[PDB]
Amino acid sequence: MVREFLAEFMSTYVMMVFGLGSVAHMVLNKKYGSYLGVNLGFGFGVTMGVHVAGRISGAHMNAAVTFANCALGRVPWRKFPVYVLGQFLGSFLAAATIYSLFYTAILHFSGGQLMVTGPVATAGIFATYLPDHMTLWRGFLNEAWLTGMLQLCLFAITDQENNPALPGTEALVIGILVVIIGVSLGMNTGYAINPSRDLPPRIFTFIAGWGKQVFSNGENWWWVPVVAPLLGAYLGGIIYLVFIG
């Protein structure tokens, strides 16, 4: 149990550091940051996390992915709290890590103040916030479908009965999938397909002086990246089992 917790903590921390840094690069600097880099930062950050903890715990790095495996009988329910606790600690510490490494850049870009919304907003480095045009229930649809897209492809990639990725190379294919999810479907909600990617960094920003507007922004958008991916991952998983399986 301890080894599984440590594996999930380290794998989530590695992935979240790479993902949050790429978002920080895009938000803070123009000539060093791009949306493609954000997709590459999050996508291949998963690949490093898979190498870290793929054999010990499976490197879920995702509360929705862990929930789907537990709800589909692949992983015992008694390990679900341990996986989520490991991912939440790893993401929270990754957010603190990015804050320390980019503290001067965040202060220089924003100008001392930490604003959730505005032209110098820096809260979006850590958590995802709904755009102006999009609505909460459209964001729920986007979050669930994107997590279902990930879980269906995740099952196909690592299904030994089906056509799998070559063992020892599945980490790269998983990273490619995360890269193209952000590329193709990630502009509507910030593709927070991971509840561990969204809430722990949001809790950090509230503590780190960004204020309570992190939760109240977008008509209380904060809960959607926590609940919608769980439904989407479950739905994406059962569809694969019914159709392909």
Ligand X SMILES: CCCCCCCCCCCCCCCCCC(=O)OC[C@H](COP(=O)(O)OC[C@H](N)C(=O)O)OC(=O)CCCCCCCCCCCCCCCCC
CB 93, min distance to ligand X, A: 10
42-64 burial by CB neighbour count: b if 16+ within 10 A, else e? bbbbbbbbbebbbeebbbbbbbb
CB 234, min distance to a copy of itself, A: 17
CB 212, min distance to a copy of itself, A: 27
Closer CB to a copy of itself, 50 or 199, in the complex: 50
The phi, psi pair for 60, rounded to 5°, reads -60, -50
Which of 115, 92, 100 lies closest to 203, judged by CA?
92
Distance CA 66, CA 95 (A): 21
CB 63, min distance to a copy of itself, A: 21
108 is a site residue for ligand X (CB under 6 A)? no
Closer CB to ligand X, 35 or 145, in the complex: 145
Residue keyed to tokens 């509507």: 188
Interface pick for ligand X out of 55, 85, 107, 137 (rule CB under 6 A): 137
The phi, psi pair for 138, rounded to 5°, reads -70, -35
128 and 49 Cβ atoms separated by less than 8 Å: no
Question: Which among a copy of itself, ligand X, none contacts residue 227 (Cβ within 5 to 8 A by kind)?
Answer: none
Closer CB to a copy of itself, 53 or 214, in the complex: 53
| Strand positions, DSSP E, the chain | none
Q: Which stretch binds ligand X (CB under 6 A): 53-61, 76-84, 142-150, 198-206?
A: 142-150
208 is a site residue for ligand X (CB under 6 A)? no
Alpha-carbon distances of 82 from 86, 96, 104, 117, rounded to whole Å: 6, 21, 35, 34
Mind giving me the DSSP string for 52-90?
Answer: HHTTTT-----HHHHHHHHHTTSS-GGGHHHHHHHHHHH
232 is a site residue for ligand X (CB under 6 A)? yes
Which of 123, 119, 106 lies closest to 204, judged by CA?
123
Question: Which among a copy of itself, ligand X, none contacts residue 183 (Cβ within 5 to 8 A by kind)?
Answer: a copy of itself
Show the site string, 143-172: x = touches ligand X by CB under 6 A, - = not.
-xx--x---x--------------------
CB 242, min distance to a copy of itself, A: 9
How many residues of this chain bind ligand X (CB under 6 A)?
13
Kindly identify the residues of this chain, within the stretch 1-20, that bind ligand X according to CB under 6 A. none
CB 123, min distance to a copy of itself, A: 18
Would you tell me which residues interact with ligand X (CB under 6 A)?
135, 137-138, 140-141, 144-145, 148, 152, 232, 235-236, 239
